[PDB]
PDB file of N, CA and C and ligand atoms in Angstrom:
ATOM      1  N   UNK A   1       0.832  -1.198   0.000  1.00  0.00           N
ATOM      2  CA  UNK A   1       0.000   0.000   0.000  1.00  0.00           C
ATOM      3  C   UNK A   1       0.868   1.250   0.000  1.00  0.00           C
ATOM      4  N   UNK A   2       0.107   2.448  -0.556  1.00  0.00           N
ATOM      5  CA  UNK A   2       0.849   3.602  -0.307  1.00  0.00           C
ATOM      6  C   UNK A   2       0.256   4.447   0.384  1.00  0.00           C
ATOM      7  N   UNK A   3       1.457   5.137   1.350  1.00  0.00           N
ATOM      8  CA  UNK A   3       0.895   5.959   2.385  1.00  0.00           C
ATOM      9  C   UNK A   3       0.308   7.685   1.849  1.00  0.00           C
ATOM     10  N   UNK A   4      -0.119   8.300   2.186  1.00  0.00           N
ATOM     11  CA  UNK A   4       0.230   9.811   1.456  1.00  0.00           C
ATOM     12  C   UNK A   4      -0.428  10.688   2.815  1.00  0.00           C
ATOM     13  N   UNK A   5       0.595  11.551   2.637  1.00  0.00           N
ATOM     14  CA  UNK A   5       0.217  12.364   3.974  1.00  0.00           C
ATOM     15  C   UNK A   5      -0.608  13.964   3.161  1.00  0.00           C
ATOM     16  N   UNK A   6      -1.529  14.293   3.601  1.00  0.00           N
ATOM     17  CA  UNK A   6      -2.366  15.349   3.195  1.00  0.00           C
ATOM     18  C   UNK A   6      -1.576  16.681   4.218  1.00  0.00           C
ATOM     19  N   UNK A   7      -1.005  17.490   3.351  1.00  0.00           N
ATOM     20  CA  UNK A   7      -0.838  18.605   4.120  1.00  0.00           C
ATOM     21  C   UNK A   7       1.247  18.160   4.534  1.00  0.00           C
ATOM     22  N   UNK A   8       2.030  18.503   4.077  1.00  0.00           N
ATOM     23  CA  UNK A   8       3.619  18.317   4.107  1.00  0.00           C
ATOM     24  C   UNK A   8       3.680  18.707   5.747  1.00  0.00           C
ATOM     25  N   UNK A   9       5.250  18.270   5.867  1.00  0.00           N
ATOM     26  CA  UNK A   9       5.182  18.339   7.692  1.00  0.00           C
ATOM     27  C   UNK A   9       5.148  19.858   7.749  1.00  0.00           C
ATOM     28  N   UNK A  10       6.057  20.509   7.030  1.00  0.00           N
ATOM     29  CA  UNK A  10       5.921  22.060   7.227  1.00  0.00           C
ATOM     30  C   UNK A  10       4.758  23.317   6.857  1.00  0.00           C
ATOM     31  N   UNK A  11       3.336  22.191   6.538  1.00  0.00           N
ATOM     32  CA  UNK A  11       2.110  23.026   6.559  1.00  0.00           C
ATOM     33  C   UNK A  11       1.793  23.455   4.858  1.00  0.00           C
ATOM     34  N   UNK A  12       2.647  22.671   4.315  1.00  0.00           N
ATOM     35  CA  UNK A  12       2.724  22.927   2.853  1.00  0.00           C
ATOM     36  C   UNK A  12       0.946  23.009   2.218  1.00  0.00           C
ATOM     37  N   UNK A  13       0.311  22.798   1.340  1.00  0.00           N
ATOM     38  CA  UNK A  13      -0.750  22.492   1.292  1.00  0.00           C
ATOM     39  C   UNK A  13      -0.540  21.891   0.320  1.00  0.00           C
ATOM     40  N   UNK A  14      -0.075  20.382   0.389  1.00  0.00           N
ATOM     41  CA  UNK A  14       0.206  19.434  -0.864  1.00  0.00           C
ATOM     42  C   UNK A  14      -0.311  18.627  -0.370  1.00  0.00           C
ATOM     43  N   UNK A  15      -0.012  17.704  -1.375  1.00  0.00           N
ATOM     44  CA  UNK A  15      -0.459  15.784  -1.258  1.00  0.00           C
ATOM     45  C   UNK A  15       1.191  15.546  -1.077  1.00  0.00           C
ATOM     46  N   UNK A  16       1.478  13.935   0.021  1.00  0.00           N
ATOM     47  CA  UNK A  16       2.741  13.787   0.111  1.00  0.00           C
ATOM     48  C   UNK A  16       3.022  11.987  -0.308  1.00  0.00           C
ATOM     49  N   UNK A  17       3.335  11.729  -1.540  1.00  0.00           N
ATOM     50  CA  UNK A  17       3.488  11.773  -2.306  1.00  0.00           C
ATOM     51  C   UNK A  17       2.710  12.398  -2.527  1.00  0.00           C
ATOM     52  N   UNK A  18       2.411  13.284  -4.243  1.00  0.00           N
ATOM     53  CA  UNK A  18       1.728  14.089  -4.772  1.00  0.00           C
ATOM     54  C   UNK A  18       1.035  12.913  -6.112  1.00  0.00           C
ATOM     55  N   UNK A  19       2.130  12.781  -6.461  1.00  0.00           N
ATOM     56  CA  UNK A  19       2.375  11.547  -8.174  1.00  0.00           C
ATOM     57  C   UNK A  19       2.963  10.287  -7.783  1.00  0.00           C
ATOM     58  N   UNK A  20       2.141   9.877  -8.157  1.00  0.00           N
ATOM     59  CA  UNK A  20       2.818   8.468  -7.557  1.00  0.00           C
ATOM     60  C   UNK A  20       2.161   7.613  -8.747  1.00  0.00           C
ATOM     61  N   UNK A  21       2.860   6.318  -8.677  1.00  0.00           N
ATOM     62  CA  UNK A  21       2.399   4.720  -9.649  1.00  0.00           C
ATOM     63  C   UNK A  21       2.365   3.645  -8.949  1.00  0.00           C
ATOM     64  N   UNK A  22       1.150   2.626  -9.661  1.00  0.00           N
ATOM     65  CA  UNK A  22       1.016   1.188  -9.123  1.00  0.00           C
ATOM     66  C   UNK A  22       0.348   0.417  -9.657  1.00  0.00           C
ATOM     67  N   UNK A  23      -0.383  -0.723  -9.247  1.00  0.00           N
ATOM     68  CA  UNK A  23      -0.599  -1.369 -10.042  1.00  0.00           C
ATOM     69  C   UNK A  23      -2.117  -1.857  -9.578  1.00  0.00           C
ATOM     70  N   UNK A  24      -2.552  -2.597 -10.864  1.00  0.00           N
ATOM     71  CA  UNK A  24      -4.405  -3.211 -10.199  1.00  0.00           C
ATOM     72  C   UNK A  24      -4.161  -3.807  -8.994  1.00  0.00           C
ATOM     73  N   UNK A  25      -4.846  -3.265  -7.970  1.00  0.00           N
ATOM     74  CA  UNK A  25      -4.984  -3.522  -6.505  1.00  0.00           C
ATOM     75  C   UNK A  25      -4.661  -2.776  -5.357  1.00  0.00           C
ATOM     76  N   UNK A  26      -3.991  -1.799  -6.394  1.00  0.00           N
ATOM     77  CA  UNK A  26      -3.435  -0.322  -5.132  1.00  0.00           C
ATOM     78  C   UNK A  26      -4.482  -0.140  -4.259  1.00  0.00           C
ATOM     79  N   UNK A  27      -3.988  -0.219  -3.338  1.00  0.00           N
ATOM     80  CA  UNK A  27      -4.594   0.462  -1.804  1.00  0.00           C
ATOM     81  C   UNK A  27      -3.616   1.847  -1.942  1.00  0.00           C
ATOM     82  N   UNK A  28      -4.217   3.019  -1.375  1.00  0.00           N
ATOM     83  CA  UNK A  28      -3.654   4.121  -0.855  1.00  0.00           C
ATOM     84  C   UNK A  28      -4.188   4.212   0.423  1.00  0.00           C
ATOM     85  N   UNK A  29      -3.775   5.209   1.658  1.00  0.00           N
ATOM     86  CA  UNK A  29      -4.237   5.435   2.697  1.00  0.00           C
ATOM     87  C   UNK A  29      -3.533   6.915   2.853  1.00  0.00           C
ATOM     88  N   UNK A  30      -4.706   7.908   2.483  1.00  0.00           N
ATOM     89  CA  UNK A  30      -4.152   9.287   2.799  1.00  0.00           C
ATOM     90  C   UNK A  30      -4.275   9.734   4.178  1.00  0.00           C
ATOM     91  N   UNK A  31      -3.308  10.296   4.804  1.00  0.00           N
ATOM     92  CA  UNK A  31      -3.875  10.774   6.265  1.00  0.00           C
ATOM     93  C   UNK A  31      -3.329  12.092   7.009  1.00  0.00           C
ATOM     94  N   UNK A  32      -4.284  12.706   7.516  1.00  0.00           N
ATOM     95  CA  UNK A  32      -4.217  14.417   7.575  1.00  0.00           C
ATOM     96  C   UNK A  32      -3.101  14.694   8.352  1.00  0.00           C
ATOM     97  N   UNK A  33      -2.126  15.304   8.196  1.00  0.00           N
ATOM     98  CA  UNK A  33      -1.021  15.479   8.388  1.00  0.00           C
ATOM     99  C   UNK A  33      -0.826  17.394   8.964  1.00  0.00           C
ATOM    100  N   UNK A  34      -0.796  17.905   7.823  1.00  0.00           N
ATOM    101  CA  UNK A  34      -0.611  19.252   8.293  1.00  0.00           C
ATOM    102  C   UNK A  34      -1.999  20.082   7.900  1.00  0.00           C
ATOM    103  N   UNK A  35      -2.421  21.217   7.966  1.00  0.00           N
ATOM    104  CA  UNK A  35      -3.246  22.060   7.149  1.00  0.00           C
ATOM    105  C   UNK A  35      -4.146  21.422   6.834  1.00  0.00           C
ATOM    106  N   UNK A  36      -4.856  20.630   7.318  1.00  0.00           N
ATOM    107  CA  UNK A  36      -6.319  20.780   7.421  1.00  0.00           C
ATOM    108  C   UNK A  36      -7.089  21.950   8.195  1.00  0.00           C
ATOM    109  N   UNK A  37      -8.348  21.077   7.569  1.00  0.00           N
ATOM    110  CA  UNK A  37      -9.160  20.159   7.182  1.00  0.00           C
ATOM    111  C   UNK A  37      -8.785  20.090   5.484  1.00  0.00           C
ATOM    112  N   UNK A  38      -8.752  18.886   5.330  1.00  0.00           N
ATOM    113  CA  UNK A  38      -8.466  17.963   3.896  1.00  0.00           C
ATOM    114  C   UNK A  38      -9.446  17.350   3.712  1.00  0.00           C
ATOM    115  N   UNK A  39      -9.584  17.371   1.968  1.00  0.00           N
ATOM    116  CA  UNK A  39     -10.659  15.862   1.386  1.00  0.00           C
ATOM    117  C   UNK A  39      -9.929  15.171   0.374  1.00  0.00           C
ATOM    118  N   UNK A  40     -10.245  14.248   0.002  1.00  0.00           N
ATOM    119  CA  UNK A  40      -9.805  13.593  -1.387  1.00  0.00           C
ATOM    120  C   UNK A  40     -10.925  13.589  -2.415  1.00  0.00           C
ATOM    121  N   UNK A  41     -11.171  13.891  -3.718  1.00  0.00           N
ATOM    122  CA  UNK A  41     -12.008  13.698  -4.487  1.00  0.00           C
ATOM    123  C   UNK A  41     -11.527  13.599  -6.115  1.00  0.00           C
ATOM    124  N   UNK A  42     -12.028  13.020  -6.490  1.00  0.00           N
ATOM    125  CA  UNK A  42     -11.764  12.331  -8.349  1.00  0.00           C
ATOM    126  C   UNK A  42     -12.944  12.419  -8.669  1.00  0.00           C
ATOM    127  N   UNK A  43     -12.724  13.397  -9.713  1.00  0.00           N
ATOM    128  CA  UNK A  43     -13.876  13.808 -10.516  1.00  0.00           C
ATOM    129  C   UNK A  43     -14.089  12.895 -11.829  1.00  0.00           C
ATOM    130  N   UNK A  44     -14.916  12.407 -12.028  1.00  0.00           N
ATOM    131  CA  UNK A  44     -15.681  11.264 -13.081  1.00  0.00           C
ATOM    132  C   UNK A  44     -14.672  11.703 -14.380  1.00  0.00           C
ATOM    133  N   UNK A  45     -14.624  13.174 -15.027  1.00  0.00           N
ATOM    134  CA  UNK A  45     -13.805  13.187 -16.098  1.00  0.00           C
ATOM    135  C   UNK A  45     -12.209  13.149 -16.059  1.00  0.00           C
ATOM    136  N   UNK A  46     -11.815  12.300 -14.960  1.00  0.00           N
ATOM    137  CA  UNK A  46     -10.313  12.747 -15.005  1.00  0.00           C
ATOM    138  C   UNK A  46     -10.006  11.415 -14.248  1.00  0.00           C
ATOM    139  N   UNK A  47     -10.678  10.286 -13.877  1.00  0.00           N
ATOM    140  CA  UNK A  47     -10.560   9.056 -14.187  1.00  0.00           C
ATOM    141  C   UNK A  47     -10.879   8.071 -14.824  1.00  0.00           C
ATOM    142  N   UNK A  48     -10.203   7.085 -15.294  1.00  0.00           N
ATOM    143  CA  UNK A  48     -10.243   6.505 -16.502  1.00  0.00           C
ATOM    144  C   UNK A  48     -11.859   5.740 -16.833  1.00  0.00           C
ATOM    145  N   UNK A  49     -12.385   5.370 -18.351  1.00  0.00           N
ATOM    146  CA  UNK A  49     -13.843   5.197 -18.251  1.00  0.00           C
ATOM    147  C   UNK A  49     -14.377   3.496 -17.814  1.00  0.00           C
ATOM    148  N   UNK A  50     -15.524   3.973 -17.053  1.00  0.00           N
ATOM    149  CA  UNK A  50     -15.907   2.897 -16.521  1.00  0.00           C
ATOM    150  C   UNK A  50     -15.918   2.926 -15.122  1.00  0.00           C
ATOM    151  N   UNK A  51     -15.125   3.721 -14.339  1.00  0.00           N
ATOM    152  CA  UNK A  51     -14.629   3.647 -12.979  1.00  0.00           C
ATOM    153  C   UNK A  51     -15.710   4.908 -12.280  1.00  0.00           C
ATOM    154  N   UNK A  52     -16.431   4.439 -11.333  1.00  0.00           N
ATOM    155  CA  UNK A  52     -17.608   5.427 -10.452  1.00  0.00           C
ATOM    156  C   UNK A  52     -16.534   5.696  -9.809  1.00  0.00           C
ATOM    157  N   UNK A  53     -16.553   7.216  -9.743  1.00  0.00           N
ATOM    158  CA  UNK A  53     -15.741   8.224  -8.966  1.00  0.00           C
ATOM    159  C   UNK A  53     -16.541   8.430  -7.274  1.00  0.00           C
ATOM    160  N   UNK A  54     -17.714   7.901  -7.487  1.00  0.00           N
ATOM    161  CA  UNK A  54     -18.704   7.602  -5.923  1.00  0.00           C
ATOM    162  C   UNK A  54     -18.219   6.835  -5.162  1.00  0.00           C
ATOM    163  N   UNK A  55     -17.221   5.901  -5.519  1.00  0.00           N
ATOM    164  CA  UNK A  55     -16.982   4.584  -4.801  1.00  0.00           C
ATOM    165  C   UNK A  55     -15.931   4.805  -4.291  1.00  0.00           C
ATOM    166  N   UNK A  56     -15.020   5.970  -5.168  1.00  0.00           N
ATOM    167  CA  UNK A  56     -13.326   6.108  -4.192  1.00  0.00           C
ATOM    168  C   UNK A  56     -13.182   7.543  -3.886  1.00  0.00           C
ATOM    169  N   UNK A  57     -14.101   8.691  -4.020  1.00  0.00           N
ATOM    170  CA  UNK A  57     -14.006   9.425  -3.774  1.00  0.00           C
ATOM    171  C   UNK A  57     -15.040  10.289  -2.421  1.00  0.00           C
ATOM    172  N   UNK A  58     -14.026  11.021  -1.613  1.00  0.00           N
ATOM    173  CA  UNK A  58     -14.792  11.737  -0.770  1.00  0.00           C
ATOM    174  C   UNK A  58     -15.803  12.193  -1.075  1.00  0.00           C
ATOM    175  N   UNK A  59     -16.798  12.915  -0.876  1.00  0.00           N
ATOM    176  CA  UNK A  59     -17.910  13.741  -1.422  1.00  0.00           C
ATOM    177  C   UNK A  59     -17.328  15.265  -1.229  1.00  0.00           C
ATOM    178  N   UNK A  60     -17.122  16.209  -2.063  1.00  0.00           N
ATOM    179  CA  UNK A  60     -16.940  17.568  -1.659  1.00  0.00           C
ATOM    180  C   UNK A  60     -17.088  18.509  -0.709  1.00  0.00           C
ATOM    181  N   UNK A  61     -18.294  18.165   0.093  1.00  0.00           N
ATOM    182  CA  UNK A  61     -18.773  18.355   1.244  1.00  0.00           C
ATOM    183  C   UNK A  61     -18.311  18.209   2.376  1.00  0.00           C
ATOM    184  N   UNK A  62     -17.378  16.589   2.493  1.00  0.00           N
ATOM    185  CA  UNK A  62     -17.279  16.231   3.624  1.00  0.00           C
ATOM    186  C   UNK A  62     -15.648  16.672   3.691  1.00  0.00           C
ATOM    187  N   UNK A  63     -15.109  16.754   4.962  1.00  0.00           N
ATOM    188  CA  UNK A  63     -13.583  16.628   5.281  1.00  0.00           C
ATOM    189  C   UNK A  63     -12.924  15.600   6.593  1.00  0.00           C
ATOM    190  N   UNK A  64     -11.615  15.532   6.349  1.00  0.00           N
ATOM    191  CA  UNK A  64     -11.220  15.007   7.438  1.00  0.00           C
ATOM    192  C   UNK A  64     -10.638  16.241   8.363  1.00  0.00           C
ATOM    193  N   UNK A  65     -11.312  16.466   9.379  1.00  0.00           N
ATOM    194  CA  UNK A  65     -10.464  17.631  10.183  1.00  0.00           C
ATOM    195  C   UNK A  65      -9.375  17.508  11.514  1.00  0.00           C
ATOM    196  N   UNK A  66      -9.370  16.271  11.596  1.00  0.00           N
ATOM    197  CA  UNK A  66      -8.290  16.060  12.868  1.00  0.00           C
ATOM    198  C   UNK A  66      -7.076  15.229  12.274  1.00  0.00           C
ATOM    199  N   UNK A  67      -5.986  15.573  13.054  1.00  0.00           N
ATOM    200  CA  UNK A  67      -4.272  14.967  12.705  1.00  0.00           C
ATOM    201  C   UNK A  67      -4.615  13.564  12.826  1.00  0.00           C
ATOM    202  N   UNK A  68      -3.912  12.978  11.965  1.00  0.00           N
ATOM    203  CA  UNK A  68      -4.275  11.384  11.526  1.00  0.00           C
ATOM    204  C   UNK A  68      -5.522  10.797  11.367  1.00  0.00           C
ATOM    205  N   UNK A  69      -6.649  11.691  10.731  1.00  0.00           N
ATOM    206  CA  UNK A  69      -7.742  11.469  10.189  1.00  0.00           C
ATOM    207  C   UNK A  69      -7.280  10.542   8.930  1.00  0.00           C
ATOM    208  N   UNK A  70      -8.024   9.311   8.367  1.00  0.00           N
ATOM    209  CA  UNK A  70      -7.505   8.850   7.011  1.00  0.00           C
ATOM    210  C   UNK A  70      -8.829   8.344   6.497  1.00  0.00           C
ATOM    211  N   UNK A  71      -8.159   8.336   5.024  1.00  0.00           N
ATOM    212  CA  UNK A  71      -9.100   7.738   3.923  1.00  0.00           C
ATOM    213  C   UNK A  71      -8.751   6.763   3.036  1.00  0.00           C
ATOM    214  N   UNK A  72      -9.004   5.721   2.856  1.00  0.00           N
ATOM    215  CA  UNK A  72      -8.570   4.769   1.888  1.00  0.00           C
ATOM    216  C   UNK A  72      -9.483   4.481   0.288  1.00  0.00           C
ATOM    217  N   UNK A  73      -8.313   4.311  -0.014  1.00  0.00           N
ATOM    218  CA  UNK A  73      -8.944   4.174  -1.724  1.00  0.00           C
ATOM    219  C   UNK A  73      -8.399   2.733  -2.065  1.00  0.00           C
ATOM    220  N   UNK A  74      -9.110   1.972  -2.940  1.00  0.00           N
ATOM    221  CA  UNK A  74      -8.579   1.020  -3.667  1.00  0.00           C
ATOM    222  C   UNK A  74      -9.027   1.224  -5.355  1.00  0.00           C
ATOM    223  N   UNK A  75      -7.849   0.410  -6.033  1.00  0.00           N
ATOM    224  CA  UNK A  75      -7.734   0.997  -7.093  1.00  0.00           C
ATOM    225  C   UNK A  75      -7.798  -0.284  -8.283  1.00  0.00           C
ATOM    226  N   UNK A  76      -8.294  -0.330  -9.009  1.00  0.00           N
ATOM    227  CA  UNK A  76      -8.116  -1.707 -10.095  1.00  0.00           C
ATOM    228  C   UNK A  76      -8.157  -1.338 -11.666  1.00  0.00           C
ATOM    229  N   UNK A  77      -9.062  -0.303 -12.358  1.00  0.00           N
ATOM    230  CA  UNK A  77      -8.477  -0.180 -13.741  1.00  0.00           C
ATOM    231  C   UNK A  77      -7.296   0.566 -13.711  1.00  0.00           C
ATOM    232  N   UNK A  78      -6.988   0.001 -15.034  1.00  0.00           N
ATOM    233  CA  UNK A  78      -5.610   0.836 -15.133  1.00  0.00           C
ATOM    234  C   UNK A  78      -5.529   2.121 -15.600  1.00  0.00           C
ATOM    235  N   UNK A  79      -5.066   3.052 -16.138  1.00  0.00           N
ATOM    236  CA  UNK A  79      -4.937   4.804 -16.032  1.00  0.00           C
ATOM    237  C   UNK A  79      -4.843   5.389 -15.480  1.00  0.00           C
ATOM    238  N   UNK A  80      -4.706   6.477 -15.876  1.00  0.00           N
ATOM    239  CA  UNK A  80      -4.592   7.785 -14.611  1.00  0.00           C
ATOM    240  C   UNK A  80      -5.979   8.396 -14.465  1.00  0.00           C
ATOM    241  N   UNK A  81      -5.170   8.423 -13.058  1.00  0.00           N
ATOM    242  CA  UNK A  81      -6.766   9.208 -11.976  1.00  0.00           C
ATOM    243  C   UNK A  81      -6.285  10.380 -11.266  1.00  0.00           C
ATOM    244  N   UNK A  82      -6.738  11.601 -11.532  1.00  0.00           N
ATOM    245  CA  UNK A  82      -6.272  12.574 -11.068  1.00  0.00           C
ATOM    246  C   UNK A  82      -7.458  12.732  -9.876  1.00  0.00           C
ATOM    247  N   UNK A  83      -6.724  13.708  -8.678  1.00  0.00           N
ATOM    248  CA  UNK A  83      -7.731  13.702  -7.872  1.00  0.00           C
ATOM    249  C   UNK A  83      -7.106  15.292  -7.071  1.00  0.00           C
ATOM    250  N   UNK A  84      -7.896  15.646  -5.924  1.00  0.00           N
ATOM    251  CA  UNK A  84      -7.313  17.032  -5.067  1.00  0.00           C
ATOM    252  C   UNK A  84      -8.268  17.374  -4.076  1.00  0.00           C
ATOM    253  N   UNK A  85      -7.566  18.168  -3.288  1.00  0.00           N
ATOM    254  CA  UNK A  85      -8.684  18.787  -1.637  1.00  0.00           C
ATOM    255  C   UNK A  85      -9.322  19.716  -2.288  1.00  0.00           C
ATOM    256  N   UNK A  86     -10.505  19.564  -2.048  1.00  0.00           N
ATOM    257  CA  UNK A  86     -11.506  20.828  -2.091  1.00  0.00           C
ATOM    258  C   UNK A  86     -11.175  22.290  -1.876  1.00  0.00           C
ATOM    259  N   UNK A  87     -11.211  21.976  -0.695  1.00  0.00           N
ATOM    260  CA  UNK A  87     -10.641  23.277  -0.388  1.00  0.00           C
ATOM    261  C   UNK A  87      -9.572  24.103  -0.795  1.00  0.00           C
ATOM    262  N   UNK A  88      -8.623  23.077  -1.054  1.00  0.00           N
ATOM    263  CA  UNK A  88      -7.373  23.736  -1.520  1.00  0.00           C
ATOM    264  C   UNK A  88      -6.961  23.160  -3.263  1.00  0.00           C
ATOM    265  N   UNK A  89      -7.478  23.224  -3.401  1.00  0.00           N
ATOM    266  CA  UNK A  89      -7.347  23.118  -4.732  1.00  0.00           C
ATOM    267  C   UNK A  89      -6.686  24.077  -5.792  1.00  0.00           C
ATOM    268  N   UNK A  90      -7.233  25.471  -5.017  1.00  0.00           N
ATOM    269  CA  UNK A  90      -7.147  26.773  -5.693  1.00  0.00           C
ATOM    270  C   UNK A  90      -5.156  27.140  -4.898  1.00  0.00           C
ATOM    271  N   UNK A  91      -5.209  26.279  -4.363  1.00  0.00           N
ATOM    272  CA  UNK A  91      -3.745  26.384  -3.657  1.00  0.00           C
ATOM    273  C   UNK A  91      -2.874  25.387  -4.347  1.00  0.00           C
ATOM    274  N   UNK A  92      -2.930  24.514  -5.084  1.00  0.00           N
ATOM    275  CA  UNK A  92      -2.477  23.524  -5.809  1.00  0.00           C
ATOM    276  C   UNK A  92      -2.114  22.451  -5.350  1.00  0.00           C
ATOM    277  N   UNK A  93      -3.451  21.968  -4.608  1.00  0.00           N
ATOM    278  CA  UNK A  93      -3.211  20.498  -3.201  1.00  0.00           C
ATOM    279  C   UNK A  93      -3.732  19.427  -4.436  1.00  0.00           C
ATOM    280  N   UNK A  94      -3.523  19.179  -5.275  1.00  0.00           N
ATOM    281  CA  UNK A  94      -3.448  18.092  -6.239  1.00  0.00           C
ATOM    282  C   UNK A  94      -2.514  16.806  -6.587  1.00  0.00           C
ATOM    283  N   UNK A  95      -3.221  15.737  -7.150  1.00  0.00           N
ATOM    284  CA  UNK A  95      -2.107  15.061  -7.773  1.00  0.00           C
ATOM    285  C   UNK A  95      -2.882  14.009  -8.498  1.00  0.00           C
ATOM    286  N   UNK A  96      -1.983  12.813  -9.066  1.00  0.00           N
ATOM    287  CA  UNK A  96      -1.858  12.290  -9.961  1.00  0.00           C
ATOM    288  C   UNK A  96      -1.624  10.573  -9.284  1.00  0.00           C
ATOM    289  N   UNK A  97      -2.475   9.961  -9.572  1.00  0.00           N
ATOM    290  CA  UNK A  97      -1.736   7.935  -8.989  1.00  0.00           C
ATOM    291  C   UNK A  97      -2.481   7.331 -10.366  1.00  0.00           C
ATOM    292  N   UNK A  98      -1.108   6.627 -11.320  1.00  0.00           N
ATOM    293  CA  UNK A  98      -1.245   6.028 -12.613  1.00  0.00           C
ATOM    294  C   UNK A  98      -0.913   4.600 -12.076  1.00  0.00           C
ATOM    295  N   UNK A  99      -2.147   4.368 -12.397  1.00  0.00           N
ATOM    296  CA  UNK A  99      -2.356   2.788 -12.144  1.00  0.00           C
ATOM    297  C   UNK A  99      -1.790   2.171 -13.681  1.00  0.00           C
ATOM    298  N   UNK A 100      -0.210   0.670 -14.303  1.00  0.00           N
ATOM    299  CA  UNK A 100      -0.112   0.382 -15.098  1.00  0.00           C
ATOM    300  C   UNK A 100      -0.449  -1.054 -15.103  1.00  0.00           C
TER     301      UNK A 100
HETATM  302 CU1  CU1 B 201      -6.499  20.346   1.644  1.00  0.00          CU
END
């Protein structure tokens, strides 16, 4: 599995990994780290077709707001799935996990 910490130790407002790769069966486990409140969300056009963005993604609405809050995703088609925090989005808390 891969870990990813939401929010860098120094309050950054990133994803930690940001880009990352793996393979059919990825587990991720993001968990709130600095600068929350954080969400995770993948929007239907920016993961690959076929894949409900309902099933691995936060809802926009919701957040994780406490230190070591987490969220897990599992992952099985292959492509890229872009995803990012709501909130910070407009801050460039984004990234990228290419499933090959
Ligand atoms: Cu965030």
């Amino acid at each position: 599995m891969i870990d990813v910490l939401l929010g860098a130790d120094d309050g950054s407002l990133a994803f930690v990994p940001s880009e990352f790769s793996c393979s059919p069966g990825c587990k991720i486990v993001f968990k709130n780290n600095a600068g929350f409140p954080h969400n995770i969300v993948f929007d239907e056009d920016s993961i690959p077709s076929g894949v409900d963005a309902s099933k691995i993604s936060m809802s926009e609405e919701d957040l994780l707001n406490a230190k070591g809050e987490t969220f897990e995703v599992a992952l099985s088609n292959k492509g890229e799935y872009s995803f990012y925090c709501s909130p910070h989005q407009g801050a460039g808390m984004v990234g990228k996990v290419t499933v090959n």
